[PDB]
Structures are given as structure tokens and as C-alpha cells.
Design a protein around this motif. Structure first.
Motif, PDB file in Angstrom:
ATOM      1  N   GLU A 293      29.472  35.528  49.054  1.00 35.04           N
ATOM      2  CA  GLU A 293      29.615  35.081  47.653  1.00 35.04           C
ATOM      3  C   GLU A 293      30.826  35.526  46.765  1.00 35.04           C
ATOM      4  N   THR A 294      31.240  36.858  47.213  1.00 42.75           N
ATOM      5  CA  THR A 294      32.553  37.165  46.424  1.00 42.75           C
ATOM      6  C   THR A 294      33.751  36.354  46.538  1.00 42.75           C
ATOM      7  N   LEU A 295      33.696  35.505  47.645  1.00 45.53           N
ATOM      8  CA  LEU A 295      34.812  34.639  47.983  1.00 45.53           C
ATOM      9  C   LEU A 295      34.746  33.366  46.591  1.00 45.53           C
TER      10      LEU A 295
ATOM     11  N   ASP B 137      38.984  31.404  42.977  1.00 42.58           N
ATOM     12  CA  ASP B 137      39.383  29.858  43.010  1.00 42.58           C
ATOM     13  C   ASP B 137      40.459  29.679  44.024  1.00 42.58           C
ATOM     14  N   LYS B 138      41.490  30.706  44.146  1.00 38.71           N
ATOM     15  CA  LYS B 138      42.503  30.484  45.065  1.00 38.71           C
ATOM     16  C   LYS B 138      42.324  30.948  46.456  1.00 38.71           C
ATOM     17  N   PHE B 139      41.100  31.371  46.706  1.00 40.60           N
ATOM     18  CA  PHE B 139      40.760  31.596  48.056  1.00 40.60           C
ATOM     19  C   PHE B 139      39.471  30.919  48.725  1.00 40.60           C
TER      20      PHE B 139
ATOM     21  N   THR C  62      48.072  43.252  48.399  1.00 37.60           N
ATOM     22  CA  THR C  62      49.018  44.108  48.193  1.00 37.60           C
ATOM     23  C   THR C  62      48.891  44.239  46.452  1.00 37.60           C
ATOM     24  N   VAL C  63      48.712  43.454  45.423  1.00 39.37           N
ATOM     25  CA  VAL C  63      48.589  43.513  44.247  1.00 39.37           C
ATOM     26  C   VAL C  63      47.091  44.668  44.182  1.00 39.37           C
ATOM     27  N   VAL C  64      45.943  44.088  44.745  1.00 37.47           N
ATOM     28  CA  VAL C  64      44.832  44.960  44.482  1.00 37.47           C
ATOM     29  C   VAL C  64      45.078  46.397  44.904  1.00 37.47           C
ATOM     30  N   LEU C  65      45.613  46.926  46.072  1.00 40.01           N
ATOM     31  CA  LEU C  65      45.813  48.256  46.501  1.00 40.01           C
ATOM     32  C   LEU C  65      46.905  48.601  45.608  1.00 40.01           C
TER      33      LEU C  65
ATOM     34  N   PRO D 132      42.605  47.800  31.127  1.00 40.95           N
ATOM     35  CA  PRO D 132      42.747  46.469  31.359  1.00 40.95           C
ATOM     36  C   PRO D 132      42.056  45.878  32.547  1.00 40.95           C
ATOM     37  N   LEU D 133      41.870  46.472  33.641  1.00 42.60           N
ATOM     38  CA  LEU D 133      41.155  46.117  34.707  1.00 42.60           C
ATOM     39  C   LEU D 133      39.788  45.830  34.641  1.00 42.60           C
ATOM     40  N   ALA D 134      39.231  46.597  33.875  1.00 45.59           N
ATOM     41  CA  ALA D 134      37.620  46.649  33.529  1.00 45.59           C
ATOM     42  C   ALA D 134      37.636  45.554  32.704  1.00 45.59           C
TER      43      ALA D 134
ATOM     44  N   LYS E 212      34.719  38.062  35.545  1.00 45.38           N
ATOM     45  CA  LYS E 212      33.264  37.781  35.781  1.00 45.38           C
ATOM     46  C   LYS E 212      32.654  38.603  37.117  1.00 45.38           C
ATOM     47  N   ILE E 213      33.078  39.817  37.289  1.00 47.44           N
ATOM     48  CA  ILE E 213      33.045  40.473  38.455  1.00 47.44           C
ATOM     49  C   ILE E 213      31.972  41.352  38.298  1.00 47.44           C
ATOM     50  N   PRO E 214      30.624  41.143  38.981  1.00 49.43           N
ATOM     51  CA  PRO E 214      29.664  42.290  38.640  1.00 49.43           C
ATOM     52  C   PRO E 214      30.099  43.384  39.414  1.00 49.43           C
TER      53      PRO E 214
ATOM     54  N   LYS F 188      28.383  45.302  41.112  1.00 46.65           N
ATOM     55  CA  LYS F 188      27.873  45.244  42.418  1.00 46.65           C
ATOM     56  C   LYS F 188      29.039  45.016  43.459  1.00 46.65           C
ATOM     57  N   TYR F 189      29.874  43.924  42.985  1.00 45.94           N
ATOM     58  CA  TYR F 189      30.964  43.710  43.938  1.00 45.94           C
ATOM     59  C   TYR F 189      32.027  44.835  43.983  1.00 45.94           C
ATOM     60  N   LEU F 190      32.148  45.417  43.103  1.00 48.65           N
ATOM     61  CA  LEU F 190      32.965  46.818  43.092  1.00 48.65           C
ATOM     62  C   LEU F 190      32.366  47.784  44.112  1.00 48.65           C
ATOM     63  N   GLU F 191      31.038  47.849  44.167  1.00 43.73           N
ATOM     64  CA  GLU F 191      30.535  48.711  45.230  1.00 43.73           C
ATOM     65  C   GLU F 191      30.661  47.936  46.553  1.00 43.73           C
TER      66      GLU F 191
ATOM     67  N   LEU G  70      34.210  57.653  40.878  1.00 48.44           N
ATOM     68  CA  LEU G  70      34.537  57.749  39.673  1.00 48.44           C
ATOM     69  C   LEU G  70      35.130  56.486  39.244  1.00 48.44           C
ATOM     70  N   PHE G  71      35.861  55.729  39.999  1.00 52.03           N
ATOM     71  CA  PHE G  71      36.672  54.536  39.556  1.00 52.03           C
ATOM     72  C   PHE G  71      35.481  53.490  39.027  1.00 52.03           C
ATOM     73  N   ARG G  72      34.448  53.339  39.893  1.00 47.41           N
ATOM     74  CA  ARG G  72      33.391  52.576  39.511  1.00 47.41           C
ATOM     75  C   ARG G  72      32.603  52.968  38.275  1.00 47.41           C
TER      76      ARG G  72
HETATM   77  C1  HEM Z   1      39.458  48.224  44.005  1.00 43.52           C
HETATM   78  C2  HEM Z   1      39.069  47.336  43.241  1.00 43.52           C
HETATM   79  C3  HEM Z   1      39.731  46.157  42.287  1.00 43.52           C
HETATM   80  C4  HEM Z   1      40.997  46.368  42.058  1.00 43.52           C
HETATM   81  C5  HEM Z   1      42.053  47.678  41.816  1.00 43.52           C
HETATM   82  C6  HEM Z   1      41.449  44.896  41.350  1.00 43.52           C
HETATM   83  C7  HEM Z   1      42.644  44.631  40.943  1.00 43.52           C
HETATM   84  C8  HEM Z   1      43.043  43.336  40.394  1.00 43.52           C
HETATM   85  C9  HEM Z   1      44.480  43.277  39.729  1.00 43.52           C
HETATM   86  C10 HEM Z   1      45.411  44.131  39.679  1.00 43.52           C
HETATM   87  C11 HEM Z   1      44.352  42.058  39.736  1.00 43.52           C
HETATM   88  C12 HEM Z   1      45.375  40.915  38.640  1.00 43.52           C
HETATM   89  C13 HEM Z   1      45.454  41.117  37.272  1.00 43.52           C
HETATM   90  C14 HEM Z   1      44.250  41.132  36.685  1.00 43.52           C
HETATM   91  O1  HEM Z   1      43.516  39.807  36.621  1.00 43.52           O
HETATM   92  O2  HEM Z   1      43.651  42.021  35.969  1.00 43.52           O
HETATM   93  C15 HEM Z   1      42.965  41.441  39.804  1.00 43.52           C
HETATM   94  C16 HEM Z   1      42.604  39.978  40.008  1.00 43.52           C
HETATM   95  C17 HEM Z   1      41.600  39.380  40.321  1.00 43.52           C
HETATM   96  N1  HEM Z   1      40.476  40.137  40.629  1.00 43.52           N
HETATM   97 FE1  HEM Z   1      40.533  42.286  41.266  1.00 43.52          FE
HETATM   98  N2  HEM Z   1      40.418  44.021  41.571  1.00 43.52           N
HETATM   99  C18 HEM Z   1      39.420  44.719  42.322  1.00 43.52           C
HETATM  100  C19 HEM Z   1      38.137  44.311  42.561  1.00 43.52           C
HETATM  101  C20 HEM Z   1      38.047  42.940  42.633  1.00 43.52           C
HETATM  102  C21 HEM Z   1      36.558  42.518  43.132  1.00 43.52           C
HETATM  103  C22 HEM Z   1      35.442  43.099  43.992  1.00 43.52           C
HETATM  104  C23 HEM Z   1      36.592  41.220  42.934  1.00 43.52           C
HETATM  105  C24 HEM Z   1      35.567  39.926  43.154  1.00 43.52           C
HETATM  106  C25 HEM Z   1      34.915  39.823  44.141  1.00 43.52           C
HETATM  107  C26 HEM Z   1      37.681  40.878  42.231  1.00 43.52           C
HETATM  108  C27 HEM Z   1      38.130  39.513  41.714  1.00 43.52           C
HETATM  109  C28 HEM Z   1      39.478  39.344  40.934  1.00 43.52           C
HETATM  110  C29 HEM Z   1      39.990  37.962  40.698  1.00 43.52           C
HETATM  111  C30 HEM Z   1      39.098  36.578  41.094  1.00 43.52           C
HETATM  112  C31 HEM Z   1      41.205  38.060  40.265  1.00 43.52           C
HETATM  113  C32 HEM Z   1      42.010  36.943  39.828  1.00 43.52           C
HETATM  114  C33 HEM Z   1      42.847  36.352  41.134  1.00 43.52           C
HETATM  115  C34 HEM Z   1      43.659  35.076  40.851  1.00 43.52           C
HETATM  116  O3  HEM Z   1      43.302  33.948  40.520  1.00 43.52           O
HETATM  117  O4  HEM Z   1      44.874  35.280  40.890  1.00 43.52           O
HETATM  118  N3  HEM Z   1      38.490  41.794  41.870  1.00 43.52           N
HETATM  119  N4  HEM Z   1      42.308  42.303  40.658  1.00 43.52           N
END
Ligand code: HEM
Length: 152
Positions: free
Chosen positions: A38-40, A44-46, A66-69, A88-90, A98-100, A102-105, A137-139
Motif C-alpha cells: 500500500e505504500t507504493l 505516483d512515480k513508482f 538518496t534524497v530520503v536518507l 517542512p517534512l511533517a 498524505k502519509i499516515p 503508520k507508514y513512518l513506523e 523521537l523523529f516519529r
Molecule cells: C524517514 C522518513 C522520510 C523522510 C526523511 C522523507 C523525506 C522526503 C523528502 C526529503 C522528500 C522530498 C521533499 C518533500 O516533498 O518534502 C520526500 C518526498 C516524498 N515522500 Fe518522503 N520521507 C520519509 C518517509 C516517507 C514515507 C514512509 C512515505 C510513503 C509511504 C513518503 C512519501 C513521500 C512522497 C510520495 C514523496 C513525493 C515523491 C515525489 O513524487 O517526488 N515519505 N520525502
């Protein structure tokens, strides 16, 4: 709330991630997507990825890993003083993506799983304890912002 010694453990573990940020980020997302399909659907791009082989072959998935980590690492290096980095991330994850919570867990547990998978025998019980507390703490601070916004 982490002690100085716990933060030291977190940042020591993070050195393992920084040696191969793209490989760790790729595996974290693949673990999330395959364990919780369900997270996928939130990406939209995956969503076009049907098999794990396609996921493994996707250079854009590695790029997003890379962006996430990179973002998470910047937060962890603040040792809890991360209000400006976290806000900003919250906000984007609650209001745009619209990420519940739970998905951060799910992704938090995926990080622990990947660390053991890539560093078996080298991710000790103390290091797991400290990393888990840091992700909690992050969550929890994200959860506070979600509540402010009324987002479920
Ligand atoms: C460690 C936890 C996470 C971090 C640090 C993180 C970080 C980021 C960052 C930096 C971006 C790009 C900037 C932004 O839109 O704010 C992003 C985009 C996004 N994140 Fe996360 N995220 C996390 C967890 C999640 C999870 C669990 C989901 C969904 C299951 C998610 C869904 C998305 C989506 C859909 C985008 C937009 C992607 C795109 O179309 O470019 N994120 N996230």
C-alpha cells in the motif's frame, strides 16, 4: 530523549549509511514497498513498478532513496534539536503527500531491518537500541505536527 552516549551510537551507525547512501536508501525503499505494498500507491512515480527486479533496476528509486536518507541524516545530526529541519517534512508529508504516521513506523522498522541485512553481526544491541530511540523521537515529533494539523 537520548543521552550523549546514545547519540554517539546513532552517529556511529550512520557512518555505515554514509559510506553507501544510495545502496542503503534503495534497500530501505524496497523493503518498505515489498513489505507494505500500500505504500507504493502513495508514489505516483513508482506505482508502475510491479516486481522487485524492476524496483532494483530503477535508477530513479535509488535517487529518491538518496534524497530520503540525506534528509534523515541531516535531522539525526542535530541530536534532537531538529525543529527547523523537521517542520517542512511533517508539513509536506501530511498536507501534500498524505502519509499516515503508520507508514513512518513501517519505514523506521525497515531501516533497522536493512542495517542488520547489510551489516550482520556489526549492528549490536546497544546500537539497535539507540537507533530505535532516535527514529521514535523523529516519529513522535512528526506526530505532534500531524495532531496540530488534524491529519490522520
Ligand atoms: C524517514 C522518513 C522520510 C523522510 C526523511 C522523507 C523525506 C522526503 C523528502 C526529503 C522528500 C522530498 C521533499 C518533500 O516533498 O518534502 C520526500 C518526498 C516524498 N515522500 Fe518522503 N520521507 C520519509 C518517509 C516517507 C514515507 C514512509 C512515505 C510513503 C509511504 C513518503 C512519501 C513521500 C512522497 C510520495 C514523496 C513525493 C515523491 C515525489 O513524487 O517526488 N515519505 N520525502
Amino acid at each position: 530523549g537520548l543521552s550523549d552516549g546514545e547519540w554517539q551510537q546513532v552517529l556511529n551507525v550512520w557512518g555505515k549509511v554514509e559510506a553507501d547512501i544510495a545502496g542503503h536508501g534503495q534497500e530501505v525503499l524496497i523493503r518498505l514497498f515489498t513489505g507494505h505494498p500500500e505504500t507504493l500507491e502513495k508514489f505516483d512515480k513508482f506505482k508502475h513498478l510491479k516486481t522487485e527486479a524492476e524496483m532494483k533496476a530503477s535508477e530513479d528509486l535509488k535517487k529518491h532513496g538518496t534524497v530520503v536518507l540525506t534528509a534523515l541524516g541531516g535531522i539525526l545530526k542535530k541530536k534532537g534539536h531538529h525543529e527547523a529541519e523537521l517542520k517542512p517534512l511533517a508539513q509536506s508529508h501530511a498536507t501534500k503527500h498524505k502519509i499516515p504516521i503508520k507508514y513512518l513506523e513501517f519505514i523506521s522498522d525497515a531501516i533497522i531491518h536493512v542495517l542488520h541485512s547489510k551489516h550482520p553481526g556489526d549492528f549490536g544491541a546497544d546500537a539497535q537500541g539507540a537507533m530505535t530511540k532516535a527514529l521514535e523521537l523523529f516519529r513522535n515529533d512528526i506526530a505532534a505536527k500531524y495532531k496540530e494539523l488534524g491529519f490522520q
